[PDB]
Amino acid sequence: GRLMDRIRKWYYNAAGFNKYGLMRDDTLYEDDDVKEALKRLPEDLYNERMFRIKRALDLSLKHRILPKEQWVKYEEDKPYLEPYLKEVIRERLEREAWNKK
Amino acid sequence: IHFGNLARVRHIITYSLSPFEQRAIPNIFSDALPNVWRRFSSQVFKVAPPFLGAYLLYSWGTQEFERLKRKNPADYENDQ
Amino acid sequence: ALLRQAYSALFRRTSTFALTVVLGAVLFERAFDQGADAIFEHLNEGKLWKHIKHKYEASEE
Amino acid sequence: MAPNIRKSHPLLKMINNSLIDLPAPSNISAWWNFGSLLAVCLMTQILTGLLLAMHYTADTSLAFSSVAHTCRNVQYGWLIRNLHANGASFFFICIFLHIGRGLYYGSYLYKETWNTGVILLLTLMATAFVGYVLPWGQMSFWGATVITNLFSAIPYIGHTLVEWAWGGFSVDNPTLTRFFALHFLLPFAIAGITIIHLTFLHESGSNNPLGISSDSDKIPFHPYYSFKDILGLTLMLTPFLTLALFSPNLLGDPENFTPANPLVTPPHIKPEWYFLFAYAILRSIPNKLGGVLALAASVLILFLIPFLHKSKQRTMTFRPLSQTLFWLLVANLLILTWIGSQPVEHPFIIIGQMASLSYFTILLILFPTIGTLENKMLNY
Amino acid sequence: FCAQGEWMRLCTSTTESEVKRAKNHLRSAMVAQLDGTTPVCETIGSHLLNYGRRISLEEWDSRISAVDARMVRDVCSKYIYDKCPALAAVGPIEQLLDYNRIRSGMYWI
Ligand code: HEM
Numbered sequence: 262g263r264l265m266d267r268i269r270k271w272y273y274n275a276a277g278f279n280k281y282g283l284m285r286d287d288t289l290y291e292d293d294d295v296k297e298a299l300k301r302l303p304e305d306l307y308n309e310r311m312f313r314i315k316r317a318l319d320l321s322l323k324h325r326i327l328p329k330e331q332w333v334k335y336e337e338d339k340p341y342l343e344p345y346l347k348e349v350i351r352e353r354l355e356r357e358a359w360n361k362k
Numbered sequence: 363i364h365f366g367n368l369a370r371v372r373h374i375i376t377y378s379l380s381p382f383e384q385r386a387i388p389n390i391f392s393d394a395l396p397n398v399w400r401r402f403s404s405q406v407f408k409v410a411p412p413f414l415g416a417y418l419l420y421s422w423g424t425q426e427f428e429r430l431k432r433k434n435p436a437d438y439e440n441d442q
Numbered sequence: 443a444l445l446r447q448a449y450s451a452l453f454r455r456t457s458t459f460a461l462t463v464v465l466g467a468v469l470f471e472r473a474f475d476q477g478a479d480a481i482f483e484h485l486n487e488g489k490l491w492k493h494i495k496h497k498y499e500a501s502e503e
Numbered sequence: 504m505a506p507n508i509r510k511s512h513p514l515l516k517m518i519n520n521s522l523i524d525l526p527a528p529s530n531i532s533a534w535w536n537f538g539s540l541l542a543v544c545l546m547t548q549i550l551t552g553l554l555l556a557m558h559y560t561a562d563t564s565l566a567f568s569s570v571a572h573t574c575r576n577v578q579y580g581w582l583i584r585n586l587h588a589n590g591a592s593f594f595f596i597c598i599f600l601h602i603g604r605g606l607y608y609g610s611y612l613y614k615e616t617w618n619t620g621v622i623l624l625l626t627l628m629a630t631a632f633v634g635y636v637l638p639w640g641q642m643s644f645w646g647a648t649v650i651t652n653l654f655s656a657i658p659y660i661g662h663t664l665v666e667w668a669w670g671g672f673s674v675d676n677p678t679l680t681r682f683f684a685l686h687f688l689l690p691f692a693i694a695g696i697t698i699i700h701l702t703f704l705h706e707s708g709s710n711n712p713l714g715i716s717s718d719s720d721k722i723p724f725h726p727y728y729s730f731k732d733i734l735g736l737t738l739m740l741t742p743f744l745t746l747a748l749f750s751p752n753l754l755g756d757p758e759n760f761t762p763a764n765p766l767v768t769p770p771h772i773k774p775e776w777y778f779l780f781a782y783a784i785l786r787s788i789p790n791k792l793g794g795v796l797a798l799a800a801s802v803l804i805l806f807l808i809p810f811l812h813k814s815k816q817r818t819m820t821f822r823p824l825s826q827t828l829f830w831l832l833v834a835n836l837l838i839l840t841w842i843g844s845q846p847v848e849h850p851f852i853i854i855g856q857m858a859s860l861s862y863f864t865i866l867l868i869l870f871p872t873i874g875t876l877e878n879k880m881l882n883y
Numbered sequence: 884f885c886a887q888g889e890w891m892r893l894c895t896s897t898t899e900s901e902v903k904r905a906k907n908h909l910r911s912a913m914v915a916q917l918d919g920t921t922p923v924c925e926t927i928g929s930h931l932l933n934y935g936r937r938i939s940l941e942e943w944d945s946r947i948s949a950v951d952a953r954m955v956r957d958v959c960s961k962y963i964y965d966k967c968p969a970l971a972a973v974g975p976i977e978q979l980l981d982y983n984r985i986r987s988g989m990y991w992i
């Protein structure tokens with residue numbers, strides 16, 4: 262029914278990056294694919310991500326978090342990178358597959 | 363050269379005061395402690411549990427080991 | 443205002459700052475040791491040789 | 504050449520690019536304070552070590568008493584001896600927190616910095632092992648015996664390797680003198696490798712507690728971290744000294760205040776606390792060969808950590824399931840430490856195997872598994 | 884680095900040669916500020932409003948000529964040495980950094 266959705270929303274809150282004002286995609290480890298995707302982000306999305314991240318690092322050093330009002334809500338989290346990232350991986354797998362043939 | 367080649371950054375303003383214009387340990391009661399408590403609270407149920415379990419297992423095993431050193435009167439009840 | 447006097451006379455010029463540390467250390471040592479030893483002995487009255495020494499120090503045989 | 508001599512000079516430039524103008528994340532916590540403590544710890548062991556070495560005599564007939572002569576006659580020899588023996592523990596406490604931090608924050612993703620790290624640990628253990636034998640007390644001798652005899656269990660080359668290591672048929676003077684040489688030597692290899700450690704590290708720079716790029720917010724190592732680290736130094740150094748000055752023998756075995764005697768086996772042959780966890784695993788596998796492999800694996804397992812990362816995120820800061828698994832593992836280690844100090848009997852035997860088994864399971868199966876599971880819960 | 888460096892030189896090791904030249908440059912500058920009617924008028928309006936009177940070049944020169952190395956050092960030390968400055972940076976400023984580091988550039992020549 263709505264079980265998968267209950268779990269996700271639960272994990273989302275348990276994770277807690279939303280308390281730093283970060284988007285799920287803001288928290289991705291920057292391996293190669295992720296690095297390429299980031300280079301493809303439009304300027305505005307890229308600067309917003311940068312501010313969010315800088316802001317989180319500053320909270321982190323201060324040992325504070327954002328006020329509860331400013332926390333990112335599960336349903337308002339914008340998966341801004343997932344689209345690019347999936348494409349980057351699709352391309353990689355194409356080349357990998359092709360270079361084997 | 364590691365300062366100047368790090369990240370493309372735009373439109374962020376920051377404001378900071380000299381250390382001599384501000385206090386070293388400000389708002390201990392209004393901000394510090396509350397947060398300390400906040401931090402402790404958010405973690406205790408993640409850290410404490412297994413340590414508590416460790417303690418139990420420890421206590422059991424220590425007491426169980428001593429109990430096995432004691433004698434069981436049921437081995438001498440018919441030794442007349 | 444000592445803080446200002448201190449600042450002007452001692453902490454402003456890096457040279458006087460070092461001088462204040464050195465001369466400061468010399469005086470701190472003399473004081474700090476005397477006090478520590480004093481505290482230690484008081485907490486141990488009549489237990490140290492310093493304390494019982496007189497009983498055999500030129501008062502036997 | 505260049506304006507300031509801090510950048511142009513071939514040496515100061517090095518000092519500057521690693522301790523002054525070195526870009527550090529603005530948010531690294533106290534957990535990042537252990538690297539510097541490890542370094543300072545190392546310089547201190549080497550220093551007190553040399554001072555002790557200048558009064559030691561590597562001979563079965565004089566070792567024990569040379570250490571006693573040092574503690575009883577050398578000016579402050581007793582203090583230096585204390586600082587050296589206890590410093591070894593400060594070293595391991597620090598190294599274990601250093602590693603922990605790394606596991607929790609995914610520092611291991613910096614593969615080379617990590618592998619050299621594993622090598623530093625191994626070298627540190629060998630150093631302390633050979634060091635421990637030098638006073639030639641009862642635990643010195645029997646610990647040396649118990650552990651070195653394990654290798655005669657290796658197939659075919661076994662007995663050889665062992666009699667080669669001892670330089671005879673048992674732990675005896677020839678073993679002692681070569682152990683002194685090794686103990687004097689290895690610390691210098693640790694210093695060397697430590698440089699390589701930091702060299703690889705500087706390729707990437709420090710990781711941070713949120714696990715996201717800190718390029719957007721870096722600050723110079725000095726004064727921020729030089730101060731933070733000096734503070735960290737005094738904060739740790741206090742309990743260290745408190746222990747060494749008020750409870751000198753708290754961590755040592757009384758059995759070592761008795762000259763080694765090959766004709767009297769101590770009742771409970773057990774190592775210093777920092778080896779207990781491994782001793783427990785050793786004894787968990789009844790079978791000379793299997794236990795040895797298990798012991799070996801208990802530390803070599805660290806070389807696999809970089810390949811068992813499945814999470815899409817670097818740290819565990821935002822991974823609550825992994826966080827508990829992490830503390831489960833920590834508790835798992837206290838338990839092994841505890842089992843390591845106990846005799847081999849029920850219920851310590853069964854508990855021991857449980858702990859040994861869960862240890863490997865958590866690192867080999869659960870961590871990677873839970874990581875994948877978490878990736879799904881983020882809709883990834 | 885060099886800039887703050889020069890400020891520290893001002894407070895600790897100014898030379899008579901430097902001030903000697905500095906004065907001549909300053910004299911020319913004040914004279915050059917009265918090159919035309921608009922600029923002379925600007926001076927009068929300003930002087931009155933700020934000094935409550937006019938200060939003739941003849942006076943300025945008198946004052947300017949009384950300055951020497953020793954004086955520059957004392958005045959500068961008095962306003963610059965070990966003071967917390969105000970900093971404004973705009974643009975691609977990642978390589979300039981840390982108020983603390985800058986604050987330290989405020990002492991020891
Ligand atoms: C004699 C032992 C060692 C010395 C002197 C040493 C020193 C250092 C120093 C100075 C740093 C930088 C500061 C810090 O982050 O703590 C560092 C970082 C690191 N060390 Fe070590 N280390 C030692 C052992 C190890 C071990 C055993 C491991 C892992 C098995 C290790 C893994 C790392 C890694 C992965 C980093 C990255 C930290 C980050 O995430 O930013 N080190 N070490």
Ligand code: HEM
Pocket residue numbers: 545548549550551552553554555556557559570584587588591594627630631632634635636637638686687688689690693
């Ligand atoms: C990596 C740093 C070192 C470690 C971890 C270490 C560890 C140890 C240990 C555990 C002992 C036994 C202490 C005891 O209980 O009596 C010891 C003893 C000794 N070490 Fe080291 N040591 C180190 C470096 C050195 C160095 C560099 C030297 C000198 C070149 C040295 C010289 C000695 C000597 C002579 C003893 C014998 C005296 C004694 O037992 O106190 N050590 N060391």
Ligand SMILES: CO/N=C(/C(=O)OC)c1ccccc1CO/N=C(/C)c1cccc(C(F)(F)F)c1
Pocket residue numbers: 625628629630631632633635636642643645646647648649650772773774775778781782785798
């Ligand atoms: C010479 O023995 N030194 C001992 C000691 O406590 O030094 C601090 C000791 C003491 C009692 C039992 C076992 C040991 C030996 O160490 N024991 C184990 C179980 C061990 C485990 C892993 C690695 C290593 C080594 F080789 F250092 F690399 C050793």
